[PDB]
Design a protein around this ligand. Structure first.
Ligand SMILES: [Ca+2]
Lengths: 26, 223
C-alpha cells in the first residue's frame, strides 16, 4: 500500500508527498 | 494537532519547527546542537526554528538556525516507516539562556495508560485542512500493544507505539511529524503516521524513542 502510506505520513510538505506518490509508480 | 488546545508561548520549550519553504515537520531539541525528528521529514535546506510560537510573526524568543547535517537512521524503511527517526545537527549551538531548553531522553520505555503531551503546528481539522499560526498541544495516553495492533494489523513493529483515543476526535495530524510525545518530562515518541487524523479506531503511531537512546547518544558523540 505504497500510496496509502505516503498519505499516512504526518508531514505537511506537498513536495515530499508528491515525491512519495510518484515514486510508488516507479 | 486535532482536538487540542493552544499551548501558550514557549510552554513546550524543546519544540522546534522544521522550515524548508514553509513549516512542514516538528522536532525536539535534545541538546544545544541537536534535534530529533522523523526520518520521513528528510529533505534539503532545512532551517530549524527554536523558541517559536507564531510561525508567521517574529515576536521574540525565536532562534532561526540552519541545519548542517541530517542523519537518518541507517535502518529506516520508507515503505513501512520502521525506524522513522533522524537527528539534525545545527550549524551553530542554540542559546539556552532563554525560553528554549532541551528534552531528556527516556530512561525506560513508557507503559500503556501513561498520559503524554503531543504538540505541533500541524493541521487542526479532522477533515479538511487548517494550519494554525500558533503551537497546539494535546494530552493523550499511550495505548496497549494489542489495541495498537488491532487498529493497524500487520503494520506495527517493536519500534512503534500508538497514543490517542480509539473514539477518535483527538490526535496529531499532517504537519506534526517529527515532533514530540513527552511523558513525565521524557521524550518517548516522535510523531510518525496514522490512518487519516482523529478517526475512530485509528490512533496516531509514534516512533518508540526508548529503543534508540544508545544510537542517539553515539550519533551525537561521533558527529
Ligand atoms: Ca514567531
Amino acid at each position: 500500500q505504497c500510496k496509502v502510506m505516503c498519505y499516512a505520513q504526518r508531514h505537511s510538505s506537498p513536495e515530499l508527498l508528491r515525491r512519495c506518490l510518484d515514486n510508488c509508480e516507479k | 494537532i486535532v482536538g487540542g488546545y493552544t499551548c501558550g508561548a514557549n510552554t513546550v520549550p524543546y519544540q522546534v519547527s522544521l522550515n524548508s519553504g514553509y513549516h512542514f515537520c516538528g522536532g525536539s531539541l535534545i541538546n544545544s546542537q541537536w534535534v530529533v525528528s522523523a526520518a520521513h521529514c528528510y529533505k534539503s535546506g532545512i532551517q530549524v526554528r527554536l523558541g517559536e510560537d507564531n510561525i508567521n510573526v517574529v515576536e521574540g524568543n525565536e532562534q532561526f538556525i540552519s541545519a548542517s547535517k541530517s542523519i537518518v537512521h541507517p535502518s529506516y524503511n520508507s515503505n513501512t516507516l520502521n525506524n522513522d527517526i533522524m537527528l539534525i545537527k545545527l550549524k551553530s549551538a542554540a542559546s539556552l539562556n532563554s525560553r528554549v531548553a532541551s528534552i531528556s531522553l527516556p530512561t525506560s520505555c513508557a507503559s500503556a495508560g501513561t498520559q503524554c503531551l503531543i504538540s505541533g503546528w500541524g493541521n487542526t481539522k479532522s477533515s479538511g485542512t487548517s494550519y494554525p499560526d500558533v503551537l497546539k498541544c494535546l494530552k493523550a495516553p499511550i495505548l496497549s500493544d494489542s489495541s495498537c495492533k488491532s487498529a493497524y494489523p500487520g503494520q506495527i513493529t517493536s519500534n512503534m507505539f500508538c497514543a490517542g483515543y480509539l473514539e477518535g476526535g483527538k490526535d496529531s495530524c499532517q504537519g506534526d511529524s517529527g515532533g514530540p510525545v513527552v511523558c513525565s518530562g521524557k521524550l518517548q515518541g516522535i510523531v510518525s503516521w496514522g490512518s487519516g487524523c482523529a478517526q475512530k479506531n485509528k490512533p496516531g503511531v509514534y516512533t518508540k524513542v526508548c529503543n534508540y537512546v544508545s544510537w542517539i547518544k553515539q550519533t551525537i558523540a561521533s558527529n
